[PDB]
Amino acid sequence: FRRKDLVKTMRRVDPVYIHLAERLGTPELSTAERKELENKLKEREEFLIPIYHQVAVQFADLHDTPGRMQEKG
Amino acid sequence: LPAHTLLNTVDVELIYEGVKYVLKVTRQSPNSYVVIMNGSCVEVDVHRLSDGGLLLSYDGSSYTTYMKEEVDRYRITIGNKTCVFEKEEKLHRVFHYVLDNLVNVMNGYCLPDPFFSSKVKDWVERLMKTLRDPSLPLLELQDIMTSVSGRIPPNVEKSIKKEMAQYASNITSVLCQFPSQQIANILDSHAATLNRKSEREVFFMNTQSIVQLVQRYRSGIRGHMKAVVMDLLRQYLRVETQFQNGHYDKCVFALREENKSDMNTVLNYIFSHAQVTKKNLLVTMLIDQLCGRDPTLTDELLNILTELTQLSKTTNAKVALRARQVLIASHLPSYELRHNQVESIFLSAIDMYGHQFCIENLQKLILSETSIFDVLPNFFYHSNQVVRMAALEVYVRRAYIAYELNSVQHRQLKDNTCVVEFQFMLPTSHPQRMGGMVSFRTFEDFVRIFDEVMGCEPIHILNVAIKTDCDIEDDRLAAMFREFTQQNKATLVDHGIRRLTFLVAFPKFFTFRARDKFEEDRIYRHLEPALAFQLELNRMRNFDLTAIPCANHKMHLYLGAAKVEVGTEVTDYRFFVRAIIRHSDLVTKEASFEYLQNEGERLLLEAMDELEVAFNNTNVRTDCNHIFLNFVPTVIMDPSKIEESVRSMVMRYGSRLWKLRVLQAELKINIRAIPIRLFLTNESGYYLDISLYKEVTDSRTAQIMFQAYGDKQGPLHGMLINTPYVTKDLLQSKRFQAQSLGTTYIYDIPEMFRQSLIKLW
């Protein structure tokens, strides 16, 4: 889980990031609107890092369990 | 316990007077036993006796038998004799017979492996033929009515008698269906009257068999036929839906917890699951007879298919895949619509042309996206002999869509040979062309007046269509035409004809170039010479292509061998699939997903089958197999929904595409029309990388450019439109990767070893 995978995961969870990214990807809006949405997206991307880092750590923690060591033998 | 110990077959070895007999014993039911002896099967009706013996029916005669087990002997008593072995028909009885046998197969009671499927196919075929026979419900009606002569009011009995008499007298005739509704009507009318005091109870009780019969045949003989097989598929799902959504232990434990009061139910589930492979063979055979040559599905069949295709457990893949095929197969044209419409337009214009509607009909035929080349080659005369020219103009005008056609002329020879001449050009490609087309009968008029019909740089294009409506046999037709083109070289010495196209009347195209090269073309066969651009096959510039023959010649599979110098050999081999989807433009009312999904999925499955056969039958070690699907018709749909559709379509078979080394795919779809290109990378079947681009034609040249949608521009952003491929595929790509890390490539170890020994010496 590098930064780009955390952002890819944010792309499908965070409502604010989803709203901004769906708007920026919409054609025929304007130049200034796209620039503003891009800067807000960068701000959310760098802002949200700690929580999704914790989430990814939990995700990796889930596959270290004794249940898997039992299933594999 | 695992589901391979609860077995229904026993091997028994009995030695009699030195001769060892190895017998297999299994069952078709709790009481129906099958014994394999000396390679032959015998069916025995076996009933358990309370005294430990068995009651057998073997050859029509009954036997009461016992066994005693000794230290090294089996003492079999039959009647009053001992053998010591050493230890080392009316059409409605057939319905029940075969249906009970098939249900027994569905419940896990199957014949032995060397004998299974030898009789089940016949049970399925006989069930189908019996159910489709109109006289079956008459026999059921006769049987239920004869066993109840009284206790039925005379009015309803007489009405039923009259209706069944009519139906019997109309057997096997158009406009005839079983009168289930009329029997229901008279019974419901008498019930509506509702006579009291023993007219009520007796009537309502003693007519239930007739109500059941009309309920079974409420949808007719064909509906009943379909319903029975649907019931068998429901019996399949009844068991197999319990072994999904988890592991075997989860299923068995959950079944134990749900059925605490009875453990035999759990055992039945496990037992029937043990023989799921044989059940799957029967399920495939049952599906073939339910939704085969009938491209339509009801809202009851669709539920069974939708549940069946969701059996994600791999052991049932055979039944899921075929079910998926049905869901896509029953949304195709039946060729009757195109044949009737095109033939009506072509024949009705001939009597007197220029009524200001037949012109528009021919224009609609030319300007439509739907293929009509399965109907056009059959217009040789049909009766009228003018339709020749009407066909000859349309086909060319339908095929030559990328050409600027400026003149068409009709000419005839002093025979029954019509020819149409065309003059056209390429606006921005290969910088004036001409051509013409003629039709003949059976073979001879082609060669007899070949030089005369030709009288319309080698810019000329000559097409010929001949009426040989029999037996798609590429070699025979190609030899028949090639034998002439190998002797008559008028195509080169007259004025210069670039290519001669041979159209066999569905259409089979054999292109020949009798100018310099051998008169054969394995690469562009079965393609129109005018629509040979509309395959994206010229992109294989760096490959020597070998075409792979296959059945159903709408799919085009090629094996490209990368071009290399006279030194190093070819290491990069790749299978390329090129298919075209032909259909009219769609009108989106939230109902355009079915066309794209079904056509793409059908071509994808056919491509995978042909790739499997081609790949396993050779040894060339391909790496990156590629599939391209051209969606001709225009569709109004947001590209994100097309992304979702192709994501589902590809991910559901990602495991097969991974096994077949299919790594890249390209889908071209015309939106609203502006084409978009979906570039898919499909590695191991967990994730699919879809990149979306539009074709940008807003340039000062004929050059087209890819433009992305902002999100994930990717490698194709700014890529032109049409680029060749090739790579090194191994051995001069891993060497570099290893050198980049400060170590040698592993297969360099022996050579250094040899060289080191030299220094050692």
Side-chain angles (χ1 to χ4, degrees), chain A residues 8 11 25 71, chain B residues 247 687 709 711:
Chain A
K8 282 187 291 186
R11 187 66 175 86
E71 292 288 318
Chain B
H247 195 252
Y687 175 66
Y709 296 88
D711 188 4

Side-chain angles (χ1 to χ4, degrees), chain B residues 113-360:
Chain B
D113 290 1
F115 296 81
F116 188 76
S117 85
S118 300
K119 291 186 178 182
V120 179
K121 67 185 184 63
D122 298 345
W123 298 338
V124 171
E125 189 176 359
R126 289 170 63 193
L127 181 60
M128 184 273 291
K129 289 178 179 182
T130 300
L131 288 163
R132 196 175 286 173
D133 196 316
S135 59
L136 182 60
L138 285 170
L139 300 157
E140 296 182 20
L141 183 58
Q142 287 169 7
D143 286 1
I144 64 182
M145 286 184 73
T146 300
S147 68
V148 187
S149 61
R151 308 185 297 281
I152 297 167
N155 300 325
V156 304
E157 185 177 358
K158 287 177 186 185
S159 181
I160 295 162
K161 187 176 174 179
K162 292 174 174 182
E163 294 292 334
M164 72 184 289
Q166 290 185 73
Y167 180 67
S169 208
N170 298 328
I171 54 161
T172 308
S173 69
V174 300
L175 285 278
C176 168
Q177 182 59 267
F178 178 75
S180 59
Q181 186 62 49
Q182 291 73 18
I183 300 165
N185 285 334
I186 194 71
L187 289 174
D188 294 331
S189 180
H190 190 287
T193 306
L194 186 57
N195 304 336
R196 271 74 167 174
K197 293 187 176 184
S198 194
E199 296 295 325
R200 184 178 62 187
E201 294 83 353
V202 173
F203 170 67
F204 278 68
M205 281 193 296
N206 285 271
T207 57
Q208 290 293 312
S209 62
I210 297 159
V211 175
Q212 289 171 358
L213 180 59
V214 300
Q215 282 168 349
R216 287 195 299 277
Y217 291 86
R218 66 190 183 275
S219 54
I221 62 180
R222 190 176 180 86
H224 182 72
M225 180 182 69
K226 292 189 172 177
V228 169
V229 177
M230 288 169 75
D231 187 71
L232 291 170
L233 299 172
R234 287 193 296 273
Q235 287 182 34
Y236 181 73
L237 288 173
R238 177 183 64 187
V239 171
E240 290 292 326
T241 55
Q242 300 295 306
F243 294 85
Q244 308 301 304
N245 303 322
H247 195 252
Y248 180 79
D249 297 346
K250 181 177 172 185
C251 174
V252 176
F253 180 75
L255 290 168
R256 183 176 177 281
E257 294 293 320
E258 287 180 359
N259 296 278
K260 298 186 177 64
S261 62
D262 182 68
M263 297 290 102
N264 279 308
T265 302
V266 185
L267 192 139
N268 297 332
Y269 278 108
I270 294 166
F271 177 84
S272 57
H273 186 63
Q275 301 298 312
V276 70
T277 58
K278 293 180 181 71
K279 288 170 62 170
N280 289 332
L281 183 62
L282 175 51
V283 166
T284 297
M285 285 188 297
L286 284 171
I287 290 165
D288 293 4
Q289 299 296 307
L290 182 61
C291 299
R293 297 183 178 184
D294 187 7
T296 187
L297 297 171
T298 66
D299 65 337
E300 295 177 340
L301 294 159
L302 281 172
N303 294 327
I304 289 169
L305 293 169
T306 294
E307 188 62 19
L308 178 54
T309 56
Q310 290 178 88
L311 301 179
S312 56
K313 188 175 183 177
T314 61
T315 57
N316 306 325
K318 291 176 181 185
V319 300
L321 176 63
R322 183 58 176 172
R324 291 177 185 167
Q325 295 174 356
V326 169
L327 291 173
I328 61 175
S330 306
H331 195 217
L332 302 177
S334 64
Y335 185 79
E336 188 61 22
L337 176 62
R338 290 189 294 164
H339 178 74
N340 287 331
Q341 294 175 326
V342 177
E343 193 172 47
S344 188
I345 291 165
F346 270 108
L347 298 174
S348 62
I350 297 296
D351 298 336
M352 202 153 268
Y353 27 90
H355 287 298
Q356 307 296 309
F357 68 91
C358 54
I359 298 164
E360 295 180 350

Side-chain angles (χ1 to χ4, degrees), chain B residues 341-404:
Chain B
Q341 294 175 326
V342 177
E343 193 172 47
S344 188
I345 291 165
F346 270 108
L347 298 174
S348 62
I350 297 296
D351 298 336
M352 202 153 268
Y353 27 90
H355 287 298
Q356 307 296 309
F357 68 91
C358 54
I359 298 164
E360 295 180 350
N361 295 338
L362 294 170
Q363 287 171 347
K364 283 170 184 186
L365 287 179
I366 289 163
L367 301 173
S368 178
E369 300 296 344
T370 297
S371 173
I372 57 170
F373 295 94
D374 302 306
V375 181
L376 286 175
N378 292 330
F379 298 113
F380 295 106
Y381 51 97
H382 176 92
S383 44
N384 297 336
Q385 309 292 346
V386 180
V387 76
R388 290 173 181 281
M389 300 177 174
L392 290 166
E393 178 161 12
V394 165
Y395 162 91
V396 173
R397 289 182 72 189
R398 178 63 182 81
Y400 289 64
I401 62 174
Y403 302 81
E404 176 176 315

Side-chain angles (χ1 to χ4, degrees), chain B residues 461-477:
Chain B
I461 309 300
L462 183 59
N463 299 272
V464 52
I466 299 177
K467 186 173 177 63
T468 57
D469 296 322
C470 188
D471 288 9
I472 301 164
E473 187 179 358
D474 289 1
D475 297 330
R476 181 175 60 78
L477 305 155

Side-chain angles (χ1 to χ4, degrees), chain B residues 30-43:
Chain B
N31 290 101
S32 180
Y33 287 61
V34 180
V35 182
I36 312 308
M37 185 273 287
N38 196 30
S40 291
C41 65
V42 61
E43 301 182 351

